[PDB]
Amino acid sequence: ANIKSNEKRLRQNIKRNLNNKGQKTKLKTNVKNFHKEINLDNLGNVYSQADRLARKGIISTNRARRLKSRNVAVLNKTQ
Amino acid sequence: MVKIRLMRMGRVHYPTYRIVAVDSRVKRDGKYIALIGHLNPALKENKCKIDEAVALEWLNKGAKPTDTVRSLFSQTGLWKKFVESKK
Amino acid sequence: TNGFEVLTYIPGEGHNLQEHSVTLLRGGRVKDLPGVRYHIVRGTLDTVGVEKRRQQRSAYGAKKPK
Amino acid sequence: KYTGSIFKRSRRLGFSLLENNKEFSKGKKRKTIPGQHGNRFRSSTMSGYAQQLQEKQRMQYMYGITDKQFRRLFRLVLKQRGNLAVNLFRVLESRLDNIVYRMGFAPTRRSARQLVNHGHVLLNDRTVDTPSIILNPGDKVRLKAKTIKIPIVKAASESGVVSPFVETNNKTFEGTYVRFPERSELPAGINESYVVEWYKRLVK
RNA sequence: UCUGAGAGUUUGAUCCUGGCUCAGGAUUAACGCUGGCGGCAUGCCUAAUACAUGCAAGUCGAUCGAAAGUAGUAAUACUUUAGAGGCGAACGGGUGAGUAACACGUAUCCAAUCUACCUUAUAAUGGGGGAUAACUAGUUGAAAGACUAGCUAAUACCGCAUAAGAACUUUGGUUCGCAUGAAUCAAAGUUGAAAGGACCUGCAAGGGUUCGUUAUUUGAUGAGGGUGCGCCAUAUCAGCUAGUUGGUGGGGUAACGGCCUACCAAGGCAAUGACGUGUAGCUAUGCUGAGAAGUAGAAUAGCCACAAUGGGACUGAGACACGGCCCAUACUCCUACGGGAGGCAGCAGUAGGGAAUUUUUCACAAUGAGCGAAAGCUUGAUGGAGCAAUGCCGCGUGAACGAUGAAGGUCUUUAAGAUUGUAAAGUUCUUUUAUUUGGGAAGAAUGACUUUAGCAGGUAAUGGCUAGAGUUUGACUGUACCAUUUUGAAUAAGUGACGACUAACUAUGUGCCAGCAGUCGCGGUAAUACAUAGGUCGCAAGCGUUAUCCGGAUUUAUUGGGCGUAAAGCAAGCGCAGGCGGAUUGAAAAGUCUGGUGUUAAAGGCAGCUGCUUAACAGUUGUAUGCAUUGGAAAC
Numbered sequence A: 001a002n003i004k005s006n007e008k009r010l011r012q013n014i015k016r017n018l019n020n021k022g023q024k025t026k027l028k029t030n031v032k033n034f035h036k037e038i039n040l041d042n043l044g045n046v047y048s049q050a051d052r053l054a055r056k057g058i059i060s061t062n063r064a065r066r067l068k069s070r071n072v073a074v075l076n077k078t079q
Numbered sequence B: 001m002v003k004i005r006l007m008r009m010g011r012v013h014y015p016t017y018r019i020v021a022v023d024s025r026v027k028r029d030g031k032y033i034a035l036i037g038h039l040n041p042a043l044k045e046n047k048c049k050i051d052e053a054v055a056l057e058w059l060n061k062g063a064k065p066t067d068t069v070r071s072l073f074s075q076t077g078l079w080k081k082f083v084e085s086k087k
Numbered sequence C: 001t002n003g004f005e006v007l008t009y010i011p012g013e014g015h016n017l018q019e020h021s022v023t024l025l026r027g028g029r030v031k032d033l034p035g036v037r038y039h040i041v042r043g044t045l046d047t048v049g050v051e052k053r054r055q056q057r058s059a060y061g062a063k064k065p066k
Numbered sequence D: 001k002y003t004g005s006i007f008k009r010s011r012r013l014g015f016s017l018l019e020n021n022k023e024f025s026k027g028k029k030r031k032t033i034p035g036q037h038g039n040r041f042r043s044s045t046m047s048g049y050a051q052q053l054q055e056k057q058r059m060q061y062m063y064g065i066t067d068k069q070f071r072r073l074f075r076l077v078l079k080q081r082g083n084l085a086v087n088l089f090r091v092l093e094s095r096l097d098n099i100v101y102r103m104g105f106a107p108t109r110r111s112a113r114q115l116v117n118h119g120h121v122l123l124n125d126r127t128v129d130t131p132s133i134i135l136n137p138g139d140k141v142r143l144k145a146k147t148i149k150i151p152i153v154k155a156a157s158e159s160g161v162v163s164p165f166v167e168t169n170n171k172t173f174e175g176t177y178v179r180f181p182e183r184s185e186l187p188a189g190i191n192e193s194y195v196v197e198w199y200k201r202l203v204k
Numbered sequence E: 001u002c003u004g005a006g007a008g009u010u011u012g013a014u015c016c017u018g019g020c021u022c023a024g025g026a027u028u029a030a031c032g033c034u035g036g037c038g039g040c041a042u043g044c045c046u047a048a049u050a051c052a053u054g055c056a057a058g059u060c061g062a063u064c065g066a067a068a069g070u071a072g073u074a075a076u077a078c079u080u081u082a083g084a085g086g087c088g089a090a091c092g093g094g095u096g097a098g099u100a101a102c103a104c105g106u107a108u109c110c111a112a113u114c115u116a117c118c119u120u121a122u123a124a125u126g127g128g129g130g131a132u133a134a135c136u137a138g139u140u141g142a143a144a145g146a147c148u149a150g151c152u153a154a155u156a157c158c159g160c161a162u163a164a165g166a167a168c169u170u171u172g173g174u175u176c177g178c179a180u181g182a183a184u185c186a187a188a189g190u191u192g193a194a195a196g197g198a199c200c201u202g203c204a205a206g207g208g209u210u211c212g213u214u215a216u217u218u219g220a221u222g223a224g225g226g227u228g229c230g231c232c233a234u235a236u237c238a239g240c241u242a243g244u245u246g247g248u249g250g251g252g253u254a255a256c257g258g259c260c261u262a263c264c265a266a267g268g269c270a271a272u273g274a275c276g277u278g279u280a281g282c283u284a285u286g287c288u289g290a291g292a293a294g295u296a297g298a299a300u301a302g303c304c305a306c307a308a309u310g311g312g313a314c315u316g317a318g319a320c321a322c323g324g325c326c327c328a329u330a331c332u333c334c335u336a337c338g339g340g341a342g343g344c345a346g347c348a349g350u351a352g353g354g355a356a357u358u359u360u361u362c363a364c365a366a367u368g369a370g371c372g373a374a375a376g377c378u379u380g381a382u383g384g385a386g387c388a389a390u391g392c393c394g395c396g397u398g399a400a401c402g403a404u405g406a407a408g409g410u411c412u413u414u415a416a417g418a419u420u421g422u423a424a425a426g427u428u429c430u431u432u433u434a435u436u437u438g439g440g441a442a443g444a445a446u447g448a449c450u451u452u453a454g455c456a457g458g459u460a461a462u463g464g465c466u467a468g469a470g471u472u473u474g475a476c477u478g479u480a481c482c483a484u485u486u487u488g489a490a491u492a493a494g495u496g497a498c499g500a501c502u503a504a505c506u507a508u509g510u511g512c513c514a515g516c517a518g519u520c521g522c523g524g525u526a527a528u529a530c531a532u533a534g535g536u537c538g539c540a541a542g543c544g545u546u547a548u549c550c551g552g553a554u555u556u557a558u559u560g561g562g563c564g565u566a567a568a569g570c571a572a573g574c575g576c577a578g579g580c581g582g583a584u585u586g587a588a589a590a591g592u593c594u595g596g597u598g599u600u601a602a603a604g605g606c607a608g609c610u611g612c613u614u615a616a617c618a619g620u621u622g623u624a625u626g627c628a629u630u631g632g633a634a635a636c
């Protein structure tokens, strides 16, 4: 009633979830730090984490694009 | 991922094929997009009334043939026209 | 087999019904008795066939004399 | 699959298989409807349904046909161009076992069917076993060779008595057929055209 | 060029209104009687009831460590796979429970989207690091396993250098749009890649083919959203809706959006039917009809929804995942009593329900899929073979000769006679079927692979491209079919009806009793209507009965009916909305007509043709209907 392919796939996705969750948490904490003490310096780091995650697929590419566009709007308004 | 392939529409102990452009994930004997031409396992000669028109369009578009599908193209000579048009 | 009680005529001369028995009813409508609208298929399950019949047997259910 | 009392049914309708062999007979020269109730009154005034059904049986008993086969052929001929009153007559007379009897190679029609079923007949370029093939004038329906020697070939080879619509090239037993049968070769046993309308009501 | 049949029945008799019944087709059919075979097709309509047991998605050693086996003195050579990794498991298969609405059909706009592999084109594929499966050891157990500590490998993972082009912004131009708004720059800033494997050559260095990878580009397929129109019954369901209607800023989604959020408001739908109830998967189509249309949504094909019930999420290009994961409920089962296991609406099959619907089968041989360079491999999809007269089609139970009449049966026109009846008996003949003998295919009139020949690119080598040779492969299968092969009519006829509609009548028995019946109606001691018999008629390997749909039924009448006396004019009036509506002129062109283009999936429908011995059937070409857009016509 069980298939080795299905069992193996479940065992792999646990490890993938751990790694991807770590990457996603760094982006979350980084954008919150940025918008906390606003500073053009942070912005760069935001670009790096979002683009890297988008390539790997972890995050949908559109979400990175909207986050990128919207974060840059705050800087122009504040500068 | 259009794939020129066959579709059985004969009867018991008598197959009958039709060359047709269809997607890979569509079931055999289901829905398709364009008609190329029919086939008969026992037509002796001219067993594959080919079209020679849209088939070149779909192959140029990137259609992937099959082993038996390719075979038919070669005796008539359709493989030659496709490869020389690529060149 | 449902929950409907219907008065069904036993079509034939002589019956083995014993107040408690099983029958395989069919369609019909006897014109003499008001309310009866069904007929019992003869010679099928518990109900016996109609012997001593050589004419139109296929309907009453009797084994070919042979 | 057929009746084994052809005298009885021919005596009832009144018309035999066109030689009166089943009417003359060697006894009593009986021309009355069979059964005890044959010499009675109430002869004429058959209803339109009555005469139509009697006539319909005449057409389909002259050739040994089942009514369902008749309905198939009528459905076939019905659709084409128009007043096809010349086609279905050719269609009804195109039966393979019927042609062998008109060929003059069989003593009787249903005996010819038996020879057809047993494989003693051939066709232009193939062999035929089923006694229902619809023929078309032009096929060289050549006879068998091992059946020309059987202890019943004598009357079979006496095809000099033959209808003009079955040309044989006598003594060569080629046995083709052209010049489709006119109504003259289809005698007054069944020569009517409201049987077509009878099947028009019953068969679409 | 379409194209339509009626009859019986109220009365003493007639005409009309009017209801009932019948003559014809059809089905996923069932029952009774009977029963030989072949070619096609169909086969749980009920309990989306519960399921024993066995199968239904894997593949790559040419990604990687290790292990094992066989040879070898060794170095090593070959084979195999538990595990890591890639890819596929979201396709394919089944069922129709739910669903009355953008579910579906049709036409569309996505200036509001995604798309892995595949197509074209264009830059790169350099260099480091840290880990863990397998293994070892220990604890805990019968085992499943689980926990703990060390050891390793990469196309697993994580940094770094580098951007042809990318993404996000900045500067002003361009071309503009349908309101938000898109389109193109030149300059600049900011941000961001990966991995190698197989083989050949080369002393080496280096070079090369191919697979694969990252970043892009072109399309296409597939997925998603919105909108117009069409798409059940019911008023003996009149109000419904408080994220419901709108704006603002923000969040989220592939994307627009009360999808979500805080604030500000009070709207939205509804008699042209909201809301509620009941019912149902929708469509192409099947049956019926002259047609308009009625009816069921068999099989199959498109789309949607579901996977014991109800929720949530990971992985991924794509799932909120039939035979993946987590939780709860219900149910069953195992245990050594601590713990666990389970989802046949996948192929068979079992139990149960039912009037009722099949092998616990063979092979991937052909077609199709997934992985692989190939070898291959996996395929209850698929192709066959069983089963069943379930439906359509076809063939058989014999042929000739044979009594102005064998026997028997039934009537006797009380000797005669008829009738069954050329039927039989009897003489000859044949073997589709049936039983031996010999031959023996079609599908594989494909093929992938491997040695050769030639071309062809690049060339220093190898792969791709055609031809020939080979391994060439069958579940059906010693099957269809064939032959002068032995025997031989031998192995094969039932069912309904006979008063009228409706083709076909006599006797015996019974005596308003027993019984028949689709309708009128038969039976009260002379029954062609009951029972039996003889005869005869209608069908035939089928025949009747029952159930359902359509026609006939102009019997809900748009085509195509009526309201004085037969059903039907409200008791009458004032009357909004609705329907209809005098004459002439002008414009527009919503109806109306017509031309062009797109589409209306394939199968089916009708016509022609081909192939099965012809047919049934299969294939083949033709064949409309509607919608949208555009260009004209101006009579109503």
Ligand SMILES: [Mg+2]
Residues within 6 Å of the ligand: A057, A058, A059, A060
């Ligand atoms: Mg993702």
Ligand SMILES: [Mg+2]
Residues within 6 Å of the ligand: E011
């Ligand atoms: Mg009367």
Ligand SMILES: [Mg+2]
Residues within 6 Å of the ligand: E023
């Ligand atoms: Mg009828």
Ligand SMILES: [Mg+2]
Residues within 6 Å of the ligand: E081
């Ligand atoms: Mg392995």
Ligand SMILES: [Mg+2]
Residues within 6 Å of the ligand: E089, E324
């Ligand atoms: Mg799965």
Ligand SMILES: [Mg+2]
Residues within 6 Å of the ligand: none
């Ligand atoms: Mg699925």
Ligand SMILES: [Mg+2]
Residues within 6 Å of the ligand: none
């Ligand atoms: Mg199927």
Ligand SMILES: [Mg+2]
Residues within 6 Å of the ligand: none
């Ligand atoms: Mg079902």
Ligand SMILES: [Mg+2]
Residues within 6 Å of the ligand: E116, E117
């Ligand atoms: Mg992929």
Ligand SMILES: [Mg+2]
Residues within 6 Å of the ligand: none
């Ligand atoms: Mg490494």
Ligand SMILES: [Mg+2]
Residues within 6 Å of the ligand: none
């Ligand atoms: Mg970097």
Ligand SMILES: [Mg+2]
Residues within 6 Å of the ligand: E155, E195
């Ligand atoms: Mg990598």
Ligand SMILES: [Mg+2]
Residues within 6 Å of the ligand: E247
């Ligand atoms: Mg708003």
Ligand SMILES: [Mg+2]
Residues within 6 Å of the ligand: none
């Ligand atoms: Mg339902």
Ligand SMILES: [Mg+2]
Residues within 6 Å of the ligand: E289
């Ligand atoms: Mg009509």
Ligand SMILES: [Mg+2]
Residues within 6 Å of the ligand: none
């Ligand atoms: Mg269906």
